[PDB]
Design a binder for this molecule. Sequence first.
Ligand SMILES: O=C1Nc2ccc(C(=O)N[C@H](CO)c3ccccc3)cc2/C1=C(\c1ccccc1)c1ncc[nH]1
Length: 293
Amino acid sequence: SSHEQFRAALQLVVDPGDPRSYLDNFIKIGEGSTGIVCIATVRSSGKLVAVKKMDLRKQQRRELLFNEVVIMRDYQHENVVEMYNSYLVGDELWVVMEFLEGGALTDIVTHTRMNEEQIAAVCLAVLQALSVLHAQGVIHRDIKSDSILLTHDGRVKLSDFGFCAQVSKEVPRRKSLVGTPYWMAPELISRLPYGPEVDIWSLGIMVIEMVDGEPPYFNEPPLKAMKMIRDNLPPRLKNLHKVSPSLKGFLDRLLVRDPAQRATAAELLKHPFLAKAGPPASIVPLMRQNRTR
Ligand SMILES: O=C1Nc2ccc(C(=O)N[C@H](CO)c3ccccc3)cc2/C1=C(\c1ccccc1)c1ncc[nH]1
């Protein structure tokens, strides 16, 4: 199909009109591999929103742009960032989202040590979201610290659904090479049909982020990191001797090469490691000060 055909199809899927009719003060605040995010203000109320802008021409696989705007429309969950509206503006898809004033987990893991009360809190929030999404056949496919956002009071919400997918009884597995190389599950890199289990592996890589500060193989070329994830034993914590046996045991249920033996989100919510999870207040110090690893 041509670019004009794709644009016309996406136009039928999004909300009509131009959101510049009610938004002001577009300022870029961050980016992903598929586009940028701006803060903006609703002109009549002063409400702050985040606007993701993705150029229809600059996508590796532009049909992925259908997925979030359809799958996640009207989705409501305590631990999921809200999508308000979506629009076509020129050759860009704009998705108007909830603004999460605490920013991304990435800026925490690069600036401070996290204790296990805080790591368990983050894991519990993400698994509460994933258990509900996976039960509806939604695979996130891009779990990583960049995808976890915080409120100023320390609540945790999952974002970055641009790569998500839908499985069903009729189409129970995906086969697309989708995600971020260092976090990708080995069966996904292997081009095997896969399901929600890939999110659990990615969550395990994010635990390594929270313990060590970076995922495995992070200054390796991405194609080389992907080969090592596919071919090597599951990656290991740099700070292995610093974590509790409970954390190690939890991680050992995530970084399981065989997806059939990997724990599910619902199974993980029962794990004793998550009994350590602190309340939102336990997370707030991570946004206000830095403590070295
Ligand atoms: O308030 C915020 N509400 C959101 C709603 C959704 C997303 C999101 O999906 N971002 C991914 C990258 O993670 C993405 C961006 C562009 C194209 C494709 C994916 C981000 C935010 C969001 C962000 C933000 C923006 C860019 C990168 C990381 C965090 C934010 N930073 C500081 C305070 N708040």
